Amino acid sequence: KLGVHSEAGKLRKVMVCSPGLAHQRLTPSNCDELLFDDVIWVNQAKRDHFDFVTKMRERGIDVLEMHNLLTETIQNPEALKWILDRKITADSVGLGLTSELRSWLESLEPRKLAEYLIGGVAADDLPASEGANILKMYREYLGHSSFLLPPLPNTQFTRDTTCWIYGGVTLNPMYWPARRQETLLTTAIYKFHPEFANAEFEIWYGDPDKDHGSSTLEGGDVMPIGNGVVLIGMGERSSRQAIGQVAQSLFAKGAAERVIVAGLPKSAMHLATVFSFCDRDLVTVFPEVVKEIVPFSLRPDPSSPYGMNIRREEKTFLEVVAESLGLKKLRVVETGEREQWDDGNNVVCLEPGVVVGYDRNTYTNTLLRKAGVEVITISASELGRGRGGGHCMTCPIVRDPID
Amino acid sequence: TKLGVHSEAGKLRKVMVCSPGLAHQRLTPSNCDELLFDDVIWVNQAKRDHFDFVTKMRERGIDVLEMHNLLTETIQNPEALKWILDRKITADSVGLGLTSELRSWLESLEPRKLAEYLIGGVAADDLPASEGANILKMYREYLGHSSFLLPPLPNTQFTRDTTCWIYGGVTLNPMYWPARRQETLLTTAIYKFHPEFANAEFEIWYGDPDKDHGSSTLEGGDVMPIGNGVVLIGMGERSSRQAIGQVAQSLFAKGAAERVIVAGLPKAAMHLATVFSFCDRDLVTVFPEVVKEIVPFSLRPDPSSPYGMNIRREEKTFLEVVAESLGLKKLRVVETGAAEREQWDDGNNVVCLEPGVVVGYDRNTYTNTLLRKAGVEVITISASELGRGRGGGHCMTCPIVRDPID
Amino acid sequence: TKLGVHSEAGKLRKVMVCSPGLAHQRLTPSNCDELLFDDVIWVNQAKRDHFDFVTKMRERGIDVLEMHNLLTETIQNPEALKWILDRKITADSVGLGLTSELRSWLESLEPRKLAEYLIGGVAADDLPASEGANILKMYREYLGHSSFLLPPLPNTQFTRDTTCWIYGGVTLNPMYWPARRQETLLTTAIYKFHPEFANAEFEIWYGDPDKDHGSSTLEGGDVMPIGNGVVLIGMGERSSRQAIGQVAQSLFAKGAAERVIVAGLPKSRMHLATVFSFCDRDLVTVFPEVVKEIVPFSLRPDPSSPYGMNIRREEKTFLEVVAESLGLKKLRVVETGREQWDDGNNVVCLEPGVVVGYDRNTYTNTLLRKAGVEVITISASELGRGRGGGHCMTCPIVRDPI
Amino acid sequence: TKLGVHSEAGKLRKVMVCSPGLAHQRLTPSNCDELLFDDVIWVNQAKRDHFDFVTKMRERGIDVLEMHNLLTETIQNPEALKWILDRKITADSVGLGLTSELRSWLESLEPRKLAEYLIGGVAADDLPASEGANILKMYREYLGHSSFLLPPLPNTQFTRDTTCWIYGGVTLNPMYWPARRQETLLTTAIYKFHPEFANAEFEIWYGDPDKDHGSSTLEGGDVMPIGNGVVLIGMGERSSRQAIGQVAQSLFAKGAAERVIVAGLPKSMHLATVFSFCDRDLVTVFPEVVKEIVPFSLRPDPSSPYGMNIRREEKTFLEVVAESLGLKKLRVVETGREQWDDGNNVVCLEPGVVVGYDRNTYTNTLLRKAGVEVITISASELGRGRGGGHCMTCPIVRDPID
């Protein structure tokens, strides 16, 4: 039954990932190294998160927290073998502490382990030793990273690393060095855990065991907007080598009938980061980016060197999108009169016309509520400096079509 | 032939080089930072300058192998070309619009010209008019993307850190920057296929263009066979511990070396051969603000431990540790970039041809004078273009045959 | 009790402060680049945060005076307003085509508003339809220009930097950056006209909004009258030896101070009080990484010297020298950046052993309590994305000898 | 005895260049950022390329003046020296501790060198031994602080910038970066005392080292006197409307020129940097930015307060410029087959004859295609200065064309 068949449809089952350890390790010094804008105050980011999480449960939406998913999953000796088998090598940990680290973890509670598998494993967290203690000399005298296992403070944006796309999902070959260790854990979930091992569903593209090279795909850039149409933001973090490959997979399994490729200006971002549906016929938009997007339609045609053909659409993205859906016009609330500045994109839809956005985009939020949209609010004090919104912070596994 | 690197100062007999070309012709003040080069150069002059520096060495009895010649030569054996094309041209690298079109093209080129493109990349530009290539042309022009089917490798120039020769073997280096991994494939290719290397006897201590490697990153500039069964491996920005840890036990496992000295580099910018370079049996240059901040580690073999290695931390200054290691009372040292320095200059990264015989940059006139004072012959070449590459005689060389001392 | 700050830990009687305003509402990601601000903030939220802060000080006695507030009142004095306007409104600053228009509209202004804009600044869309403003409205939209006629001063928020008080007297600081120079004009015209300041006794040690100072900068964060005739100034950063030399010299000449300790800081690119702050008579927090690098120097008078003083190097740690400087045996130091990273420097002393900090710094704030210190907290979430803490967000005017 | 620049293309007659000097020697990788230079160049070799340049003009009958010679000639007149020093050396720049020593030192020096140091700076080291200087070396090493009593001015090599000639008047410009206002002083003085100047005729439309010019910042490179009372002036990030407007309102009111076309630059260059003349109707541009600039015609008007009107244009800048030179349209070569180069910033020794960089083979060829003789200087060093011949020159006397 699993499958996201639109963006605005009714949401039922979403993954998400509260902040936590991974972030506790952050540090002005390590911020960028670690790929996270600003050191947040973890305790309250967790409160605020679960908070957002609740306003979603209180609507009868099944919220899965990666953290549980991971904790359950590794209660299966085989899966756990599976993660560790890949997550502790002479190449990532170092040959001098592969057995040390492994056994330590293997020797912790189901919960304290999932924590570390996400938030990471400092040398400190290990019992005295020769080796653990050369890594402490390293971080100490010269200030090297003391990470056996590196934190993934970006797990908390679950949107990015996998995509439910109709009756199936992609395991995403991430852009930046750090996040690539994300896609693995989530694979192990989809792969072992009892709500999926049983699930009927295909894996469109991806595999944490291959090396994907220049091919990267990030959830943000993927939009299954129904009618068998997939939006893909291409250019910045998701690439032609990657896209065109999903394109053909989707096509070669009657998942989707046409992808529409959103070419994103470089001269960092994600589609949904500048384009966000709220209602059947309405989208939040970051002007200055969108008005410079260049559309291209991939389509199944047996007379292509690949089974695909590609047009340059003749209309603006908004026009092309407008049609693809069976519409003529797209209601547009552009952000990016005005009290102050906010960016109100990257909102998530719980249902046709129901949106969760930030407690701070006050101007945008009354326009949204002026276009007849109900806005659930959550707090952007900390989750906000992570540059992520509601849409970034969720991963739809189950969402209805809009006929 | 018996290939090996048994020192930093020894008589140099065989060097690999690569001159600037199509790679650097492709540089622009806006594509040059993602391309991992520092500044646009006068390619046509850099060449004249590089052929100068290549010739100055050859004129001294030394074999100098041009990468481009070597590849161009390798590119002839269809087993080889195939062996490269199969791993360079694939969907993840090129995409499904282009592979055939691309390789089909590639293979239709004359050999020499194929290695040009192999080092310097290939834009849509260069491919024949095609549905496919135009999309890319129209992605570039319209959306500001890159036309790069195969991406230029302006850094090949820097054959030093793309592979090291540690005594009777070479390491296939897993590069730091996702930009330069593409490089290793080519050298390896040469080492495996080129008449000169295929028949030669030598080990492969560490590496494989066919395995990922993750956090293990080893760059050659960081590696120093200083003779006396010791290896100095700088551990800083480019060379991680996972790689060093391994290249270590592979060296020990075959009595290639006795002692590895991890040069602990503070926070992570440049190679070790960049603040610290050799000159004579007993002379070294030193970026003092950095050298003086290293923390030396002695990493020896041990049957007494699981991983047959033991690692102790050393209280003497790095210079001292190195002294001890060469059986030496202590090193004569000339510092580079406050006294009667007429103007600022960085003298390091000079290459030895042989003890007391060295190549550095013309412009570094204050340092190169000391070098002379301390009794070294200093041969110069033009910094004007080569040096704006942020790299000197050392970085630009990858020794293959160099005699030990004494 | 005359106006004067005579310690750092001592009893806090009168401080000045400035809450997030119009200047912050103007921040958009594309310009807080160049207005010396790290992020764009919820402004409504920040005001709350700042008020809370305020109350928490006031509800304990402190005479808290708010810039906007004092400036509003100041303006009501026609002579004062002209003073300000003759200077903020030039042809070098606003421009030939817009000096009349923009001044004339400003005086049409109701005071609470007029001042709202002095700190917050004027863009060309607060202006009456006009030809001259339109080429601006024009410049900014087509050629992506700074449309601002008067620059927004988000930083006035940090009242400690624009002026210090040093025992009986005040320095009006020649800010470093250009994003901030403007700031002092306003504070100067307050001390100068405002009723409250205009009449009582105090000295001007250093500085003049009128004068072009050159490579002389001095930022308040860098000048701590620790009391006991001693004055530490942190030099090398925002605060240059060209000012410091002179502050010191006037301080000796008017005998505000017996000794100036230059806490020469290692160049980088961070005031002194963002790395080393007082919690108690014998207590400081301390960003150990930066502190352990400071090289102290001692300035003293010298009746017989040319320049009225004679500086010499201090052999013990900076910290040891401060210590022996207030005649303590040893300063208890607490460091700051075990369960997540923490920076809790920059707490302000409301009295000996009572400070204001941020709620996010629980580790450090924990130690501080253990140090015999009671810690009032306020919310960082927005106030602390600023760049500042209790110590930045306050300019003490009246604080007791310790 | 009269001077001026009545075009860009006319027979050049008098140019002021400045050869890379002691200041370039002072450049270190970790300092050349705050000095505002883009690379530590090889001085001796910049020095020889620059001369080569100097000579190559000197041979086509041009009279070149070096800023080092002229500064020299100047400061031998004691009053011009007193005149500079009293401004160059103050307690706000050299610091009370040193003015005395520092000034009494230079005065002891011979011309050739004393000038040398002005353009070059002077660090503690250079000072004769003294308690004063060492406490500066003290800071330098121990603390990383500058120890420059006087600032190095390695940008002096770019004379186009500091002073403009426009039709028998000249602007002594208020430079953008603090790190460069120090030149204006020096050139100003030469023009004010040196017999080659103090005696000729010409006005001073805009400029005074003395005044503080708020946001009014103007640079030569943004200013082109093209011919019949048309002055191009790019208003961007370097040249500010605050001046631009004064500079016009001075030009008109004095008969000097009949229109300014403000060349509106996108955010973040000099005009002469993306747009340059090689002949009566021949220019090189840089399409990324030339294509996207919004001109403005600025002309005099009796029927208005500030006595000017600005109409925006809809025609492209290139077009605007053509219609004001009275030409059908503009012949255009675009730069910025083999490899990338920006062939721009070429300077005209006469109409159709120009000096560019030798590296730029490609553009040189199009230019040669277009009927320009292209005399070339090396780029290996002077090129890392980011500027070309246009940059490296100060048209003092140049013939009109219409």
mmCIF file of C-alpha atoms in Angstrom, chain A residues 23-257:
data_model
loop_
_atom_site.group_PDB
_atom_site.id
_atom_site.type_symbol
_atom_site.label_atom_id
_atom_site.label_comp_id
_atom_site.label_asym_id
_atom_site.label_seq_id
_atom_site.Cartn_x
_atom_site.Cartn_y
_atom_site.Cartn_z
ATOM 1 C CA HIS A 23 24.158 17.482 16.846
ATOM 2 C CA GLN A 24 25.533 17.407 20.363
ATOM 3 C CA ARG A 25 28.959 17.021 18.750
ATOM 4 C CA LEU A 26 28.622 20.152 16.623
ATOM 5 C CA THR A 27 30.988 23.074 17.246
ATOM 6 C CA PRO A 28 31.670 26.389 15.498
ATOM 7 C CA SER A 29 34.932 24.741 14.515
ATOM 8 C CA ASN A 30 33.269 21.611 13.154
ATOM 9 C CA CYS A 31 30.072 23.129 11.748
ATOM 10 C CA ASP A 32 31.009 23.249 8.056
ATOM 11 C CA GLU A 33 33.234 20.192 8.234
ATOM 12 C CA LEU A 34 30.004 18.573 9.468
ATOM 13 C CA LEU A 35 27.592 20.238 7.004
ATOM 14 C CA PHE A 36 25.304 22.189 9.330
ATOM 15 C CA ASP A 37 24.782 25.945 9.318
ATOM 16 C CA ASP A 38 24.896 26.971 13.003
ATOM 17 C CA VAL A 39 25.406 25.146 16.308
ATOM 18 C CA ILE A 40 21.837 24.685 17.599
ATOM 19 C CA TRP A 41 20.805 24.190 21.242
ATOM 20 C CA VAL A 42 20.086 20.477 21.088
ATOM 21 C CA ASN A 43 17.761 19.990 24.083
ATOM 22 C CA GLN A 44 15.205 22.453 22.746
ATOM 23 C CA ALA A 45 15.524 21.480 19.095
ATOM 24 C CA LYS A 46 14.365 18.038 20.266
ATOM 25 C CA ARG A 47 11.425 19.551 22.192
ATOM 26 C CA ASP A 48 10.420 21.684 19.226
ATOM 27 C CA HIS A 49 10.791 18.733 16.884
ATOM 28 C CA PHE A 50 8.642 16.213 18.752
ATOM 29 C CA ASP A 51 6.342 19.240 19.047
ATOM 30 C CA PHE A 52 6.020 19.557 15.246
ATOM 31 C CA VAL A 53 5.866 15.753 15.272
ATOM 32 C CA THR A 54 2.850 15.824 17.554
ATOM 33 C CA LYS A 55 0.751 18.322 15.629
ATOM 34 C CA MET A 56 1.133 15.618 12.955
ATOM 35 C CA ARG A 57 0.232 12.616 15.085
ATOM 36 C CA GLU A 58 -2.714 14.602 16.511
ATOM 37 C CA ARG A 59 -4.107 14.538 13.009
ATOM 38 C CA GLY A 60 -4.017 10.770 12.676
ATOM 39 C CA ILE A 61 -0.823 10.773 10.672
ATOM 40 C CA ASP A 62 1.462 7.866 11.548
ATOM 41 C CA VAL A 63 4.826 9.382 12.480
ATOM 42 C CA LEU A 64 7.844 7.084 12.280
ATOM 43 C CA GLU A 65 10.998 8.360 13.991
ATOM 44 C CA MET A 66 14.086 7.055 12.250
ATOM 45 C CA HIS A 67 15.499 6.552 15.726
ATOM 46 C CA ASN A 68 12.992 3.853 16.717
ATOM 47 C CA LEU A 69 13.096 2.323 13.261
ATOM 48 C CA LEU A 70 16.877 1.984 13.708
ATOM 49 C CA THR A 71 16.620 0.669 17.282
ATOM 50 C CA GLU A 72 14.089 -1.985 16.383
ATOM 51 C CA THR A 73 15.914 -2.982 13.212
ATOM 52 C CA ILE A 74 19.225 -3.707 14.915
ATOM 53 C CA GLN A 75 17.400 -5.947 17.344
ATOM 54 C CA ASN A 76 17.823 -8.335 14.446
ATOM 55 C CA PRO A 77 21.363 -9.792 14.698
ATOM 56 C CA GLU A 78 21.459 -10.220 10.898
ATOM 57 C CA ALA A 79 20.582 -6.651 9.953
ATOM 58 C CA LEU A 80 22.975 -5.316 12.574
ATOM 59 C CA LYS A 81 25.659 -7.567 11.186
ATOM 60 C CA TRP A 82 24.605 -5.945 7.906
ATOM 61 C CA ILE A 83 25.149 -2.299 9.003
ATOM 62 C CA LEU A 84 28.265 -2.943 10.964
ATOM 63 C CA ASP A 85 29.633 -5.173 8.188
ATOM 64 C CA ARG A 86 29.755 -2.024 6.046
ATOM 65 C CA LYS A 87 30.105 0.676 8.657
ATOM 66 C CA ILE A 88 33.373 -0.343 10.302
ATOM 67 C CA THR A 89 36.333 -0.918 8.000
ATOM 68 C CA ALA A 90 40.076 -0.339 7.856
ATOM 69 C CA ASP A 91 39.033 2.491 5.497
ATOM 70 C CA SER A 92 36.556 4.445 7.625
ATOM 71 C CA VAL A 93 37.487 3.534 11.186
ATOM 72 C CA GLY A 94 41.141 2.535 10.760
ATOM 73 C CA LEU A 95 42.679 -0.882 11.094
ATOM 74 C CA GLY A 96 43.773 -0.161 14.657
ATOM 75 C CA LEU A 97 40.280 -0.058 16.181
ATOM 76 C CA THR A 98 37.923 -2.055 13.962
ATOM 77 C CA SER A 99 37.521 -4.807 16.554
ATOM 78 C CA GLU A 100 37.589 -2.394 19.509
ATOM 79 C CA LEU A 101 34.742 -0.202 18.204
ATOM 80 C CA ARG A 102 32.580 -3.018 16.850
ATOM 81 C CA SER A 103 32.474 -5.043 20.067
ATOM 82 C CA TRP A 104 31.890 -1.976 22.251
ATOM 83 C CA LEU A 105 28.746 -1.094 20.280
ATOM 84 C CA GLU A 106 27.572 -4.673 19.838
ATOM 85 C CA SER A 107 27.781 -4.482 23.636
ATOM 86 C CA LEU A 108 25.321 -1.620 24.222
ATOM 87 C CA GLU A 109 21.538 -1.271 24.673
ATOM 88 C CA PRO A 110 19.331 -1.284 21.583
ATOM 89 C CA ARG A 111 18.804 2.391 22.060
ATOM 90 C CA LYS A 112 22.237 3.698 23.030
ATOM 91 C CA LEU A 113 23.492 2.036 19.826
ATOM 92 C CA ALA A 114 21.050 3.675 17.436
ATOM 93 C CA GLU A 115 21.964 6.995 19.034
ATOM 94 C CA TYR A 116 25.630 6.497 18.181
ATOM 95 C CA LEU A 117 24.924 5.036 14.734
ATOM 96 C CA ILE A 118 23.469 8.495 14.059
ATOM 97 C CA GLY A 119 25.145 10.957 16.399
ATOM 98 C CA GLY A 120 28.485 9.254 15.984
ATOM 99 C CA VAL A 121 31.234 7.729 18.089
ATOM 100 C CA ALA A 122 34.050 9.803 19.542
ATOM 101 C CA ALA A 123 37.189 8.042 20.784
ATOM 102 C CA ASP A 124 36.142 9.375 24.194
ATOM 103 C CA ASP A 125 33.089 7.114 24.249
ATOM 104 C CA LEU A 126 35.460 4.133 24.286
ATOM 105 C CA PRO A 127 37.249 2.458 27.197
ATOM 106 C CA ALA A 128 40.918 3.332 27.701
ATOM 107 C CA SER A 129 43.333 1.982 25.140
ATOM 108 C CA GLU A 130 46.536 2.341 23.232
ATOM 109 C CA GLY A 131 44.640 3.142 20.054
ATOM 110 C CA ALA A 132 41.622 5.100 21.233
ATOM 111 C CA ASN A 133 44.323 7.148 22.896
ATOM 112 C CA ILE A 134 46.466 7.878 19.863
ATOM 113 C CA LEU A 135 43.292 9.365 18.360
ATOM 114 C CA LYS A 136 43.025 11.510 21.473
ATOM 115 C CA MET A 137 46.596 12.610 21.055
ATOM 116 C CA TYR A 138 45.707 13.515 17.487
ATOM 117 C CA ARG A 139 42.641 15.646 18.264
ATOM 118 C CA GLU A 140 44.586 17.071 21.205
ATOM 119 C CA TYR A 141 47.998 18.178 19.908
ATOM 120 C CA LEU A 142 47.106 18.935 16.283
ATOM 121 C CA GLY A 143 43.324 19.052 16.542
ATOM 122 C CA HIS A 144 42.331 16.348 14.036
ATOM 123 C CA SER A 145 38.816 14.949 13.991
ATOM 124 C CA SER A 146 38.469 12.460 16.826
ATOM 125 C CA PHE A 147 35.673 10.609 15.088
ATOM 126 C CA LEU A 148 35.533 6.853 14.881
ATOM 127 C CA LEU A 149 32.069 7.246 13.454
ATOM 128 C CA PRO A 150 31.016 10.650 12.160
ATOM 129 C CA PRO A 151 27.768 12.269 13.182
ATOM 130 C CA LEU A 152 24.944 12.816 10.735
ATOM 131 C CA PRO A 153 23.217 15.900 12.059
ATOM 132 C CA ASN A 154 21.553 15.911 8.608
ATOM 133 C CA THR A 155 19.632 12.696 9.331
ATOM 134 C CA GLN A 156 17.118 15.062 10.812
ATOM 135 C CA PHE A 157 16.217 16.104 7.266
ATOM 136 C CA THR A 158 14.834 12.719 6.193
ATOM 137 C CA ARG A 159 13.354 14.154 3.014
ATOM 138 C CA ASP A 160 16.723 14.156 1.288
ATOM 139 C CA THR A 161 18.112 10.654 1.611
ATOM 140 C CA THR A 162 15.194 8.624 0.335
ATOM 141 C CA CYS A 163 12.154 9.269 -1.852
ATOM 142 C CA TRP A 164 8.846 7.593 -1.926
ATOM 143 C CA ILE A 165 7.742 7.875 -5.527
ATOM 144 C CA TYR A 166 4.397 6.232 -6.242
ATOM 145 C CA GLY A 167 4.552 2.516 -5.455
ATOM 146 C CA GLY A 168 8.302 2.533 -4.662
ATOM 147 C CA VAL A 169 11.362 4.359 -3.274
ATOM 148 C CA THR A 170 14.911 5.542 -4.129
ATOM 149 C CA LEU A 171 18.059 4.998 -2.063
ATOM 150 C CA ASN A 172 19.807 8.295 -2.724
ATOM 151 C CA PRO A 173 23.468 8.753 -3.713
ATOM 152 C CA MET A 174 24.008 11.956 -1.734
ATOM 153 C CA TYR A 175 25.929 15.063 -2.824
ATOM 154 C CA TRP A 176 28.377 15.893 -0.032
ATOM 155 C CA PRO A 177 30.868 13.578 1.667
ATOM 156 C CA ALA A 178 29.207 13.571 5.124
ATOM 157 C CA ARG A 179 25.620 12.578 4.208
ATOM 158 C CA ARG A 180 26.557 9.498 2.196
ATOM 159 C CA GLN A 181 26.747 7.518 5.444
ATOM 160 C CA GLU A 182 23.110 8.513 6.021
ATOM 161 C CA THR A 183 21.566 6.584 3.170
ATOM 162 C CA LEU A 184 22.949 3.341 4.618
ATOM 163 C CA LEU A 185 21.177 3.327 7.995
ATOM 164 C CA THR A 186 17.859 4.118 6.333
ATOM 165 C CA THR A 187 18.445 1.307 3.833
ATOM 166 C CA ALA A 188 18.885 -1.088 6.728
ATOM 167 C CA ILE A 189 15.509 0.000 8.003
ATOM 168 C CA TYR A 190 13.656 -0.399 4.709
ATOM 169 C CA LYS A 191 15.549 -3.682 4.327
ATOM 170 C CA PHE A 192 15.049 -5.472 7.642
ATOM 171 C CA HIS A 193 12.382 -3.712 9.674
ATOM 172 C CA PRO A 194 9.015 -5.492 9.932
ATOM 173 C CA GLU A 195 6.864 -2.667 8.499
ATOM 174 C CA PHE A 196 8.889 -2.863 5.260
ATOM 175 C CA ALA A 197 10.505 -6.312 5.015
ATOM 176 C CA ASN A 198 6.869 -7.272 4.500
ATOM 177 C CA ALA A 199 5.847 -4.197 2.531
ATOM 178 C CA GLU A 200 5.169 -4.618 -1.163
ATOM 179 C CA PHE A 201 7.378 -2.082 -2.943
ATOM 180 C CA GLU A 202 10.112 -1.698 -5.526
ATOM 181 C CA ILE A 203 13.463 0.081 -5.311
ATOM 182 C CA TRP A 204 13.473 2.474 -8.242
ATOM 183 C CA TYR A 205 17.115 3.510 -8.141
ATOM 184 C CA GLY A 206 19.882 3.448 -5.573
ATOM 185 C CA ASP A 207 22.080 1.116 -3.563
ATOM 186 C CA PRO A 208 24.398 1.973 -0.678
ATOM 187 C CA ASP A 209 26.775 -0.771 -1.835
ATOM 188 C CA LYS A 210 27.613 0.597 -5.301
ATOM 189 C CA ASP A 211 29.768 3.650 -5.879
ATOM 190 C CA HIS A 212 27.640 6.088 -7.849
ATOM 191 C CA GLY A 213 30.271 8.632 -8.894
ATOM 192 C CA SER A 214 29.002 11.901 -10.363
ATOM 193 C CA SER A 215 25.434 10.531 -9.945
ATOM 194 C CA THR A 216 23.685 12.157 -7.018
ATOM 195 C CA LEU A 217 20.020 12.395 -6.231
ATOM 196 C CA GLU A 218 18.495 14.201 -3.238
ATOM 197 C CA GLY A 219 14.913 13.885 -1.966
ATOM 198 C CA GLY A 220 14.355 17.609 -1.955
ATOM 199 C CA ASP A 221 14.697 17.596 -5.746
ATOM 200 C CA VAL A 222 12.101 14.811 -6.233
ATOM 201 C CA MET A 223 8.372 15.541 -6.512
ATOM 202 C CA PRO A 224 5.834 12.871 -7.423
ATOM 203 C CA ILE A 225 2.877 15.143 -8.103
ATOM 204 C CA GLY A 226 0.506 12.514 -9.409
ATOM 205 C CA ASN A 227 -0.846 11.704 -12.815
ATOM 206 C CA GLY A 228 2.419 9.780 -13.127
ATOM 207 C CA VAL A 229 4.404 13.034 -13.280
ATOM 208 C CA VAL A 230 7.683 13.457 -11.424
ATOM 209 C CA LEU A 231 9.304 16.798 -10.852
ATOM 210 C CA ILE A 232 13.119 16.637 -10.557
ATOM 211 C CA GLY A 233 15.295 19.568 -9.566
ATOM 212 C CA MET A 234 18.487 19.154 -11.562
ATOM 213 C CA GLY A 235 21.708 21.150 -11.464
ATOM 214 C CA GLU A 236 22.869 21.754 -7.906
ATOM 215 C CA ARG A 237 22.730 18.553 -5.773
ATOM 216 C CA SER A 238 20.980 16.128 -8.135
ATOM 217 C CA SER A 239 22.706 15.393 -11.446
ATOM 218 C CA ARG A 240 21.939 14.341 -15.005
ATOM 219 C CA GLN A 241 23.947 11.162 -14.572
ATOM 220 C CA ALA A 242 21.642 10.399 -11.648
ATOM 221 C CA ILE A 243 18.339 11.830 -12.876
ATOM 222 C CA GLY A 244 18.300 10.386 -16.377
ATOM 223 C CA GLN A 245 18.882 7.060 -14.675
ATOM 224 C CA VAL A 246 15.963 7.252 -12.317
ATOM 225 C CA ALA A 247 14.054 8.565 -15.295
ATOM 226 C CA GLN A 248 14.568 5.347 -17.210
ATOM 227 C CA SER A 249 13.978 3.113 -14.184
ATOM 228 C CA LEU A 250 10.656 4.750 -13.335
ATOM 229 C CA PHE A 251 9.710 4.482 -16.981
ATOM 230 C CA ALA A 252 10.902 0.884 -17.231
ATOM 231 C CA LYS A 253 8.477 -0.164 -14.500
ATOM 232 C CA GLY A 254 5.293 1.725 -15.247
ATOM 233 C CA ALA A 255 5.863 3.851 -12.181
ATOM 234 C CA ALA A 256 5.721 7.189 -14.019
ATOM 235 C CA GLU A 257 4.839 8.391 -17.532
#
